[PDB]
Design a binder for this molecule. Structure first.
Ligand SMILES: CCCCCCCCCC(=O)O
Length: 133
């Protein structure tokens, strides 16, 4: 079910990431650096367990989870959230909850590219990743 998402992916397009970060309360200096970073995202599985790494010259993160089972997460911007990841319409949907707030991180494959849509408040960011061999 998750298999075409697996592998190493590199950021190749970003729209409205500053808006998204600002909505989350990320400070201006972090938003500068992040606006010029191109992370590598690595998605792997081992049985029921998925591990999602995000690597860059600025922030690195790693999470492991089972689909459909809540997990604790500390995000790149230091939010402590309650998370769940699930497949919905063939999209990998990651929902984070904290302080009564929510944000969604939705991944879908379109023409072989991985499109990540980030929504918080009214801000909608679209980031495109392409697969590394
Ligand atoms: C430093 C800002 C962090 C915002 C939350 C994480 C954004 C992930 C973006 C991505 O994986 O392409």
């Amino acid at each position: 079910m998750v298999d075409a998402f697996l592998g190493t992916w590199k950021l190749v397009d970003s729209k409205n990431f500053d808006d998204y970060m600002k909505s989350l309360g990320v400070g201006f200096a972090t938003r500068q650096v992040a606006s010029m970073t191109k992370p590598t995202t690595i998605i792997e599985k081992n049985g029921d367990i998925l591990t999602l790494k995000t690597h860059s010259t600025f922030k690195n993160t790693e999470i492991s989870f089972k689909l459909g089972v809540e997990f604790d997460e500390t995000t790149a911007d230091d939010r402590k959230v309650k998370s769940i990841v699930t497949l919905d319409g063939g999209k990998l949907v990651h929902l984070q909850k904290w302080d009564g707030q929510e944000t969604t991180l939705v991944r879908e494959l379109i023409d072989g590219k991985l499109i990540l849509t980030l929504t918080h408040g009214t801000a909608v960011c679209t980031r495109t990743y392409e697969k590394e061999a």
